[PDB]
Design a protein around this ligand. Structure first.
Ligand SMILES: Cc1cc(C)cc(S(=O)(=O)c2cccc(N)c2C#N)c1
Lengths: 405, 534
């Protein structure tokens, strides 16, 4: 077809990102996957006169043991001009949502000849006994941001009929995926979904359950004892004192009073009636999320994760520190009982998903893990068509006891 | 002999123009030479004369090779290419062979055709004795010796050219590095020799000439660090110059060679040798080798006496990785498939940094190893670690940061890495409670650190030239010193606690170490944190 010209943001140049060493099993997978796409004409081998490069790797889904190729276009997406797909606040409320992989569709459409160069990538060789296998896309790449954009039109068409004949269903496209939500009980939903697949299969883009707003923010509950020790109170006061950054109405003087005097931690203390009121009053303020927090579209979304141990993990999406748009806990997946990275990645995924559903926008992550560790194994358990941004941190001890609530 | 391979399109960096530098007229000898030499490649078609319609110029030199063009500028102006050296294959990653051979594909650089369009930038000048009127000008029609694109382009060319032979003969191993071509196989000599020739003539069929089996390098192959044999690799033993007087610069280079050695021959030490550097005023100042240094320098000559032989990689077997702690922050490891038949070995030194612990450290080792393994063997090692599964479980389940260790197995090879101490999860009944506090004047650096306990006890101390933290920690130090086996210590420091949590067993701070030692001494310690200033 006639290709739409794509260009890089002004001044910017193509990505020259290095490839991470890939394991044996996945090298072949890629090589296999690639010699084939070459035949089909999707990609073409390049030379040395091309200095750009992007990382690639392969992942696997369930019931789909067959390897799937994945490219890290984060840098490129960042340098690619902007365009054009709107976000509905509908699926936020739906009773159920289903995600569909519609990346294939893109490979049909061609990519502007002079932009192709930028899509260069490399299949590495074990022990560098061979030079890499340089390729470059000729079609629309998957996971690239311009792709769902350029394929917009055709997409709209393709759907309109399922659309117009089922305005009781929401359809959201975020890159290689499509989110399909309905309040229709599972029976008609699943069936209506499968029907939708066919509708697409019919055109040839092939497609192989969630529960929105079931995602309610978690409360911060304060412990209750029949008797409180010096220690108990101490821990309690600290908690609140910190918590007063979210709710300015929390007060800690009455309790702080009982703590005057160098007594033993084990020592037991009886609450003065004034401390009983203060506390009771605090329990109230905590019964609901702070007032005045409203999502701003022009600012980045942020997600912090804390390791709580025992397989537990807590998190907070916010734009301004202490004004969380949503917060939550997450208990490890049955079977990751021995490794954090597995868990942490899974976690990173669910959260990004909700972010998408809700604000159709991915959060930048602050990860409680050493970069080295992350970079070595995150791919071994990834399973999304997209890759969010992230940085690595040192969990303040406090923000951790708090959310433990 | 030139060639018939499609040239690679090459252009100058965005918006720059070809080199324009002057020629350094030479002696009667240095010009006569370059007149001959150039008339040679001239006749061979490699370079052709150019007239005045070429405004560029690169400096031509003439050095008598005993027992040359300056493209510095050109190169700056030329585009960038991909990677002319992703990574070198490491010996431990190669699989043995029956026969091996490296061919000096040498001057093939000059067999590969340079993009016609570009050739114009390659213009250079042969001056005049008395700077008559013109100078004899030329340009290249083939990959130039010393040009930015040369390797790169030659690399690819070679690869396309070798794809079909690689296809036909899939049991043969061709490896191209620089201007060499290492080839391996499992054919018996005769069959090997044949294919080589086959190949040889195959290249020659593109213009790339090659040496006769007559003038062709043979095993062992010296591969940067190793002596390569078809069934074994060896650590080309090392030489340490025995001498009278030692200059600084010397000791440096000495500790250099040594540090690289320690990877293969652990046991090597230089602690007393680095000391000879303290205060050094000039790189050429001679130093009196201390007696301890004498005893080290010699004990090292003994170690590096015994060469090291090794094994190659057998895919049909598992990769085993074993680690040992030589000292605080020092780990040695060796990788093998069959006990005592090493594939690779090494060691890591960890500058304590802020605050770590052995387990955390052990963890970093594993990680590093895992990554280089993947690079070399494409897979990762099962591990044999000097740590108790109980020890690990305790630590990891409770650390604030995400961490993991691949399938591993405890190996009782003392000294095992363990947790020097663990803070109690809750207050200790029947234990003195020290409420500690420290403060110092930021400006004056004047401070007081002290405590008071539920059992009446107290103490305080005035500190000259201290700080905004030292005091706080000191507070706790005192508390620890005067406490006895069981203690409860409440502080308001964030820095204090946060740190002690990580249960560090080594720190950059001498102070911290004090506390750590103290902490390890106690039988049961419970540390609690309460907001400050209320
Ligand atoms: C990929 C590669 C790199 C180098 C440096 C040398 C070779 S080789 O085939 O010449 C070789 C030489 C000696 C021992 C080996 N076991 C191998 C083998 N195989 C291959």
């Amino acid at each position: 077809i006639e290709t739409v010209p794509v260009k890089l943001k002004p001044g910017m140049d193509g990505p020259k990102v290095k490839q991470w060493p890939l394991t044996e099993e996945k090298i072949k997978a890629l090589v296999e996957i690639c010699t084939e796409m070459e035949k089909e004409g999707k990609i073409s081998k390049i030379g040395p006169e091309n200095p750009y490069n992007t990382p690639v790797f392969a992942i696997k889904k369930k019931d789909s043991t067959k390897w799937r190729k994945l490219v890290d276009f984060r840098e490129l997406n960042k340098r690619t001009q902007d365009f054009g797909i709107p976000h509905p606040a509908g699926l936020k409320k739906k009773k159920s949502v289903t995600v569909l992989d519609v990346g294939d569709a893109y490979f049909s459409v061609p990519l502007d000849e002079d932009f192709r160069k930028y899509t260069a990538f490399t299949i590495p060789s074990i022990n560098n006994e061979t030079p890499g296998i340089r390729y470059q896309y000729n079609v629309l790449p998957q996971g690239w941001k311009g792709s769902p954009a350029i394929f917009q039109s055709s997409m709209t068409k393709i759907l309109e009929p399922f659309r117009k004949q089922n305005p009781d269903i929401v359809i959201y496209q975020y890159m290689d995926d499509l989110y399909v939500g309905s309040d229709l009980e599972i029976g008609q939903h699943r069936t209506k979904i499968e029907e939708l697949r066919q509708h697409l299969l019919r055109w040839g883009l092939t497609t192989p359950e969630l529960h929105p707003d079931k995602w309610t923010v978690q409360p911060i509950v304060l412990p209750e004892k029949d008797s409180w020790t010096v220690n108990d109170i101490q821990k309690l006061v600290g908690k609140l004192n910190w918590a007063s950054q979210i709710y300015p109405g929390i007060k800690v003087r009455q309790l702080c009073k009982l703590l005057r005097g160098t007594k033993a931690l084990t020592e037991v203390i009886p609450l003065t009636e004034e401390a009983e009121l203060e506390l009771a009053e605090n329990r109230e303020i905590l019964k609901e999320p702070v007032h005045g927090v409203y999502y701003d579209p022009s600012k980045d979304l942020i997600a912090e994760i804390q390791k709580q141990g025992q397989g537990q993990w807590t998190y907070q999406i916010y734009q301004e520190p202490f004004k969380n748009l949503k917060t939550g806990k997450y208990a490890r997946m049955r079977g990751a009982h021995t490794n954090d990275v597995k868990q942490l990645t899974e976690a990173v995924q669910k959260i990004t998903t909700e972010s998408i559903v809700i604000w159709g926008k991915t959060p930048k992550f602050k990860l409680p893990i050493q970069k080295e560790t992350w970079e070595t194994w995150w791919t071994e358990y990834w399973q999304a068509t997209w890759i969010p941004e992230w940085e690595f941190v040192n969990t303040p001890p406090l923000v951790k006891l708090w959310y433990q609530l | 002999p030139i060639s018939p391979i499609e040239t690679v399109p090459v252009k100058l960096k965005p918006g720059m123009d070809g080199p324009k530098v002057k020629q350094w007229p030479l002696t009667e000898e240095k010009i006569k030479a370059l007149v001959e030499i150039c008339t040679e490649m001239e006749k061979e078609g490699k370079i052709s004369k150019i007239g005045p319609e070429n405004p560029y110029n690169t400096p031509v030199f003439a050095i008598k090779k005993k027992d040359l063009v300056d493209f510095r500028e050109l190169n700056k102006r030329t585009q960038d290419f991909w990677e002319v050296q992703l990574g070198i294959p490491h010996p431990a990653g190669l699989k043995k062979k029956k026969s091996v051979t490296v061919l000096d594909v040498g001057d093939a650089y000059f067999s590969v055709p340079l993009d016609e369009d570009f050739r114009k930038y390659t213009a250079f000048t042969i001056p005049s004795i008395n700077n008559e009127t013109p100078g004899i000008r030329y340009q290249y029609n083939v990959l130039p010796q010393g040009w930015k694109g040369s390797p790169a382009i030659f690399q690819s060319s070679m690869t396309k050219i070798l794809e079909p032979f690689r296809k036909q003969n899939p049991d043969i191993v061709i490896y191209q590095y620089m201007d060499d071509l290492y080839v391996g196989s499992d054919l018996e000599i005769g069959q090997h020799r044949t294919k080589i020739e086959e190949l040889r003539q195959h290249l020659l069929r593109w213009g790339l000439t090659t040496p006769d089996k007559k003038h062709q390098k043979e095993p062992p192959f010296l591969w940067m660090g190793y002596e390569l044999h078809p069934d074994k690799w060896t650590v080309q033993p090392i030489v340490l110059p025995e001498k009278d007087s030692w200059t600084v610069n010397d000791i440096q280079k000495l500790v250099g060679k040594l540090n690289w050695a320690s990877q293969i021959y652990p046991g090597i030490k230089v602690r007393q040798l680095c000391k000879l550097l303290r205060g050094t005023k000039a790189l050429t100042e001679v130093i009196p080798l201390t007696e301890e240094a004498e005893l080290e320098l010699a004990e090292n000559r003994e170690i590096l006496k015994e060469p090291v032989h090794g094994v190659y990689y057998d895919p049909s077997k598992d990769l085993i990785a074993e680690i040992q702690k030589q000292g605080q922050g020092q780990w040695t490891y060796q990788i093998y498939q069959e006990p005592f038949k090493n594939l690779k070995t090494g060691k890591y030194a960890r500058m304590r940094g802020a605050h770590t612990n052995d387990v955390k450290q052990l963890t970093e080792a594993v990680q590093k190893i895992t990554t280089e393994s993947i690079v070399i063997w494409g897979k990762t090692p099962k591990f044999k670690l000097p740590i108790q599964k109980e020890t690990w479980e305790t630590w990891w389940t409770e650390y604030w940061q995400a961490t993991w260790i691949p399938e591993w197995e405890f190996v009782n090879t003392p000294p095992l890495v363990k947790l020097w101490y663990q803070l109690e999860k809750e207050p200790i009944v029947g234990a003195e409670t020290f409420y500690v506090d420290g403060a110092a004047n930021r400006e004056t650096k004047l401070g007081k650190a002290g405590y008071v306990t539920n059992r009446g006890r107290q103490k305080v101390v005035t500190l000259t030239d201290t700080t905004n933290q030292k005091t706080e920690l000191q507070a706790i130090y005192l508390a620890l010193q005067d406490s006895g086996l069981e203690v409860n210590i409440v502080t308001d420091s964030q820095y204090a606690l946060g740190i002690i949590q990580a249960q560090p067993d080594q720190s950059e701070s001498e102070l911290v170490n004090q506390i750590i030692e103290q902490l390890i001494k106690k039988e049961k310690v419970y540390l609690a944190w309460v907001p400050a200033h209320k």
